[PDB]
Design an enzyme around this catalytic site. Structure first.
Site, short mmCIF file in Angstrom:
data_model
loop_
_atom_site.label_atom_id
_atom_site.label_comp_id
_atom_site.label_asym_id
_atom_site.label_seq_id
_atom_site.Cartn_x
_atom_site.Cartn_y
_atom_site.Cartn_z
N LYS A 1 39.30 70.95 18.98
CA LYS A 1 40.15 71.91 18.19
C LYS A 1 39.72 72.12 16.96
O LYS A 1 39.57 71.24 16.10
CB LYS A 1 41.52 71.23 18.01
CG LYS A 1 42.08 70.48 19.17
CD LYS A 1 42.66 71.55 20.43
CE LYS A 1 42.62 71.01 21.77
NZ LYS A 1 43.12 72.20 22.52
N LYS B 1 47.76 79.45 32.93
CA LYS B 1 48.80 78.28 32.85
C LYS B 1 50.12 79.12 33.71
O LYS B 1 50.71 79.97 32.69
CB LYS B 1 48.93 78.13 31.46
CG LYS B 1 47.72 77.36 30.62
CD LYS B 1 48.22 77.07 29.31
CE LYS B 1 46.80 76.51 28.84
NZ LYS B 1 46.71 76.38 27.41
MG MG Z 1 43.78 78.16 23.73
#
Ligand code: MG
Ligand code: MG
Ligand code: MG
Ligand code: MG
Lengths: 361, 367, 361, 367
Positions: B163, B263
């Protein structure tokens, strides 16, 4: 230092006059520490018309309340940024909140919304009818009626899987319209492109066709193949959809509806963009009482005449009125927004019922 | 003949293993379990668990409100006809994909049990393929993240999601070059920016760095990401801006990416996820298939789709339950065994929550 | 552990009713270790219509057999991947194999194909006629006939190098159609773009034109220059051709034919894509007996009504029937697919002849 | 006047020199020889030999089935009218280019003999130009392939086709940089990926490497290859996705490539190969012209087209018969002499197989 102090949520059960037979409307009251109160309305047109529904609306105010408490409501772009961070999308939730802060700002500023939205005057805005879907002579009877009532623009709901009937509808209505009147053929996403192309290229009428297909891509495709002005509506959820519509050359107008685009601040940005690219626009809300109609009407009245088409007043379709005597109302096919500071309508909570939720700090 | 008979809604308060602080303590997930019963006693379960209420257009209270709106309309439907149930939900509440995903997941469960087949097989897979799982490597200095990865590696992770993001190019640059240079052999990283870059910062950092690893969703919109993609040399992975099938089609026609994550809670369920998966295979996309959040119930649903995906197109999945402090379905579902997870082979979904572990239902709907 | 155990290939010699005077159809039986048997059909429309022919079909089953033996037929996407690896293209070979595995899956699942393909009901699907090419009053007589038989959509075969006659054909048929009926002008690749443009822009009819030219590029070019809905068919071999058609804005509909696209699994992916982009579709097979018509019909019946146009039943054109009393059949211009698990048709091998090939492990 | 009188089909079981193992022992090629007789006793021969049945849409048994379907329609045709014969085959069996190529090759033979000219001259060439031949360098480590190339070089090869590909970027990267860095001076390599990359892996590897050699067909489709091409710096060679002339036109208009390979069995013969060749010259493409597989008969046909191609556009040809263990036409056709091969100058094709060397015919067709 002005701070939002409390949010109160009311749920209005509004039967339609001509029956889904009812609307679920949410009224929102926003208080501040300095005793200035703003109001907003979000009333989706049932739960099937747009990504919007009354119980989700109330659930979204719940998710946002704790982030709205203590904000300075005069800072409208900041309020919207915070709503976007805390709950992405859900424009239907955001609209009444943004509406109520505008109401506050107008009251603090001593100015009606139409002047904060830039207008020179409380312009009387032409109103337009809704003609529900039926046979060629039926719809033509409903139009004769609306014309007697003073409507000079009419929105005919057409659509289906049957090219021949929409052809019949269009050619009858387009020819048997009173002189000087305007008609829009509202298909509300009910055509596939094949039907749109067959219908429109079989007909001499060159009236506005509104949102013929489910998506922007499908509408743009129809537009390149037919000769009518295309008006977009339901597929426009945010500013980037309007930019895409413009860049695809998909349309010559859009409807702008606060509850679909997330309120007055977002609607105004769209309206200014439409003026800059030459669009013509219907500015109105999705449904609800004269409170929602009034907010839209302030933005409609402040739009340059070259770009402004008629507005629809949703409250015309309701059996009831919770705010009798307030807001822009039809007077001979024209509605003038109020000139008092802010929104210019003050609901009486006694008329509304007992609050279904309330948030304090 | 088969008919939905009752819908029951549960609200689970899921504590996270690692709270993180916000400019707010982000503490817990709000997860909804839905149980669908039918007239022949076949019951299916589904889960919808947004990553809090600021990650996507989704939130727990909105999800339970959406089920309330749809319930009257689902009661009576044949849950074996999946496309049809999806059309009804689309007619009756446009958008709200986060609402639709648990309903569709429960119907797929029901369909699998009626057919006597595991979801991965109905989804076309030859076998219960063990799927590689990736690590989550939190933002920090070059030296931290690299130490967090040696740690990840010791737990069996071979793919890592680093991240990065924020409006200071200089340290994003340092992070990327450090992490990309010092991976264990055979390991892989993706730089998840999470919409934190403007296009100016994306172009400055990516064109400053020699690393050619995947960059995931650098910017907020598809249009911004496609702009960056034309100007930089790295493979681009899209994720959060993809809300529906037309956005995938748009991503494809602009050449905006070489892969996507799929997702269910973002796109509305397994039926919709599957159509996108198959589209990705047709155009040669590489894909991460996983859910947005939640227990091993949402994770198992996604893993069935992931296991059925051809190996050329299939990258690692993230398991959301790995970040939870609690477990309402202990010993069920696909779990990480040394960097891999294997979906069940029982008919349907292959997980059966115990209502006793869930609290009292918050809503119930019947005919 | 369910495994394909044996493949048996039958060759059916089918004379046409109205005479090439015959079709070469291949029936395929697939056995499994658990005694569940599936059947499929591939019957190209002679060897000149598409990249397909009966003897190549049988040769392709031979090349693939040893790779199909022992596969789990419930895993349909996996079966297709294996067919694509082992024999690229040859969609005509792959269709009956994929059809038979679907039949197995439906039998194992206890569900008819239309429900596995997502449909709510065994919808009665409107059937459409084939009007063979002739003079303006000839074709108009053939249509009066079909209408008496209950067809309400008609596919007129037109085409040639002669603009004047196609103009005459189109304008006569489009005007002298019974009320409420639909006509498609099936040109079957017989025009160059120059002819398409001259013809279509000389005529007021705005009916569907199907595959006017040999290629996608030539069709897209015609589409930008004329006003009719364009339907694509023969140039669509695989999913990527459909994506290209969509991205070029070439069409508003496609026909989907299992034997052209490689079976039900590929057809379903196309069908879902067509629904997502607003296409309208004719879903039917290329030719053959009611076994091929039935498989297509399961997919047609499970398509949303907004997107589904009439289907053609190839068996209407055959002198014979090897599977009398089985499959979707015309009943007052409508065909209902069966509701039994799987395909819902079981050929009797005694009616078929002696197997021309057989593969075991 | 001249009329096709008989078609005779032979099936040759060709063992490969180097079987390779599959995840299957790929052992032998299935080759079809076709003999076309005419009423004036001029006989032409053609060959169609797919590289097994998984390389392209082509297989031996399908090829012999296709000839059966077309035979009734070719019987009676004037084989001197090549375009016309091609149109008939196109009317009577669309697609199936692998079927049409040997028929067209045999007509070209006949035409050449009637004209008293070698194919290279009918194809416009000034002379029987010796054409450079390339090596096939099998996949392995950096150090292996590089040793396989020194070996190639000692046999007279100056152009080498290095087979890379697979879903591990890291070793594709190592192979490319190693091989590209350590070529003999004056030598050339092409990296044949053979559709093994997804676009993500293509972009990662090519943008990680300094090598600017040709990359051949990185991805499965034209659309994927054109996407990669816009994002990388190497010259792109297309091959397997080009099935017909419209795909070449599409490749050209998207700017997808700077060269193509032309293989008669893929595109339907010499008539169709020639039109593509000429198109390539018009747009400045560089081209490898060779067949898909087979004996020195298919190789000689392709070499006539290759020798007639202007030197600016002509790269090395691969000779398929170099990989065979057997030779049914010994001492005939263009063969490799120290890295070059020269097409014959006899009228027509310049090879005459002995039916006695071929086995009994498997099919015969006459009027
Ligand atoms: Mg993402
Ligand atoms: Mg509208
Ligand atoms: Mg057709
Ligand atoms: Mg190649």
């Amino acid at each position: 230092s002005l701070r939002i102090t409390r949010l109160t949520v009311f749920h209005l059960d509004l039967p339609l006059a001509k029956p889904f037979d009812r609307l679920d409307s949410t009224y929102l009251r926003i208080d501040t520490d300095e005793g200035v109160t703003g109001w907003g309305e979000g009333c989706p047109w049932g739960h099937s018309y747009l990504p919007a529904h009354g119980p989700g609306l109330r659930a979204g105010i719940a998710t946002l309340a704790p982030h709205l408490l203590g904000l300075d409501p005069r800072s409208l772009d900041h309020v919207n940024r915070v709503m976007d961070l805390q709950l992405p999308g859900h424009s239907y939730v955001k609209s009444p909140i943004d509406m109520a802060c505008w109401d506050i700002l107008g009251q603090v500023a001593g100015l009606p919304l139409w002047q904060l939205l830039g207008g020179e005057a409380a312009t009387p805005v032409p109103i337009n009818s809704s003609i529900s879907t039926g046979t060629p002579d039926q719809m033509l009877g409903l139009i004769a009626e609306a014309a007697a009532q003073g409507y000079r623009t009419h929105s005919a709901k057409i659509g289906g899987s049957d090219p021949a009937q929409d052809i019949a509808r269009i050619e009858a209505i387009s020819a048997g319209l009173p002189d000087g009147h305007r008609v829009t053929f509202d298909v509300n996403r009910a055509w596939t492109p094949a039907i749109a192309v067959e219908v429109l290229n079989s007909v001499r009428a060159r009236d506005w066709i509104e949102q013929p297909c489910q998506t922007l891509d499908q509408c743009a495709h129809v537009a390149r193949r037919v000769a009518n002005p295309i008006m977009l509506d339901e597929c426009l959820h945010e500013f980037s959809d309007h930019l895409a519509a413009w860049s695809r050359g998909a349309c010559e107008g859009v409807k702008i509806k606060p509850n679909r685009v997330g309120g007055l601040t977002r609607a105004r940005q769209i309206r200014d963009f439409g003026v800059s690219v030459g669009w013509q626009m219907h500015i109105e809300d999705v449904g609800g009482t004269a409170l929602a109609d009034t907010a839209a009407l302030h933005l409609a009245a402040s739009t340059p005449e070259a770009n402004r088409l008629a507005s629809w007043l949703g409250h015309a379709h309701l059996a009831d009125d919770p705010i009798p005597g307030q807001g822009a109302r039809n007077r001979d096919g024209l509605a003038t927004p109020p000139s008092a500071p802010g929104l210019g309508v003050i609901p009486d909570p006694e008329a509304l019922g007992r609050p279904v939720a309330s948030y304090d700090e």
